[PDB]
Chains A and B, each alone.
Chain A
């Protein structure tokens, strides 16, 4: 996260980090105690992934941490079925043992297709993660967060030569300087609705980070919520 602020412990209890041979390569969100949602381009790699929830400062072992092995990876079935790199950029992780929900480890809410999109069109979301705090710079130690406005489709499409699918949306600032970045991928874009946070996107991609005239690109979760509910349903 470029240009954000230090979060407080417990401020984003649905945020998890993905660790592999390299630590903290991506982010994710707690769906329930056995399931994480993230971006497919983070996890369709064959890397053996450990998930850590309740995390705040990734340099120190903190007593709130809960570490779990990933036992299954489900990229959305359309992700591997196409050449385009970021269309359908979403994936589910099943965990070896259930999380223990508490103040630092809490799921994110997920509305149905209609209402996830309504909340998104409120136009203000939060992103968080431990990715780079400058384009090609150093990564964060303390969890970062950032309020980002929704960018309308016409503006988004005209900001890039690249194809922006209906399964993507834009968020960021006209003047630049504030954006998600490499390493934040798979983390949540959430909308607060009377103090209840709902998942509205997945951090997916962009052309560089925080460049003026460019915006961050997010997977549109509303298009996938019916799929999420089915795959993560507990018994």
Chain B
């Protein structure tokens, strides 16, 4: 299984620095050129930097090389990006990427990581509050019953929401967060089930926010 695990991103104040890492397995690391591709708000993809198998060929997109430095360590199967003097417009999801086929520096990409989120902002970290969403009464006329979790007033993205530790996935919707006038994010994750099946399970939403080292497991009930 090809794996590309990026880390080191997160929230950083303007002018400070980050080091992104990507640790690779499932292929012969030193047979391939490796690259960083970022997805910036709007969902444009943009190649940022790349480096040949041996570290003697590579390059940079416009307006970054004075601040950004790519490197690789073949003994640790890792690729790196040093990011200095960060600016707001550097905010993006940074993917670690692998050249297809020959491993040529000039090829396109066949494998992608999950990305590390880099946020440049003055605002400080703030952990979320998790509140239950439970209807006041339940209508016999509705074929489904709904409940949820309101994950309110946090910063930055992301939060990951799961139900019953990932056991419950059918009928779950986790909505995109909206930025509030406070500058904090909020979202809600809901699940709907056939009305008569409601009592056959417990329903617990598990909210995780790594930037604040917050982990919550909220059991939702009727009241």
Contact = CB atoms under 8 A, between A and B. Distances in A.
Interface of A: 154, 157-163, 213
A202 B116 CA distance: 48
Q: Is the interface of B mostly helix, strand, loop or mixed?
A: loop
22 contacts: A157-B106, A158-B101, A158-B104, A158-B106, A158-B107, A159-B102, A160-B102, A160-B103, A160-B104, A161-B32, A161-B33, A161-B52, A161-B53, A161-B102, A161-B103, A161-B104, A162-B53, A163-B54, A163-B56, A163-B57, A213-B101, A213-B102
Nearest to B56: A163
A163 B102 contact: no
B31 interface: yes
A59 B107 CA distance: 46
Interface size class of B (residues with CB under 8 A): 10 to 19
A160 B54 CA distance: 12
Contacts of B104: 157-161
A154 B107 CA distance: 10
Contacts of A159: 102, 104
Contacts of A163: 52, 54, 56-57
B118 to A, nearest CB: 29
Nearest to A84: B56
A179 B68 CA distance: 42
A163 B99 CA distance: 15
B100 to A, nearest CB: 10
Contacts of B54: 163
A159 B101 CA distance: 8
Contacts of B56: 163
For the complex of A and B, the 5 pairs showing the least CB-CB separation, nearest first, are A161-B103, A161-B53, A158-B104, A158-B106, A157-B106
B27 to A, nearest CB: 12
Interface string B23-39: 00000000111000000
Contacts of B53: 161-162
- Among A154, A158, A159, A213, chain B packs the most CB atoms within 10 A around the CB of A158
Interface in B78-118: 99, 101-107
Contacts of B105: 157, 161
A158 B103 CA distance: 8
A162 B54 CA distance: 8
A213 B102 CA distance: 9
Contacts of A157: 104-106
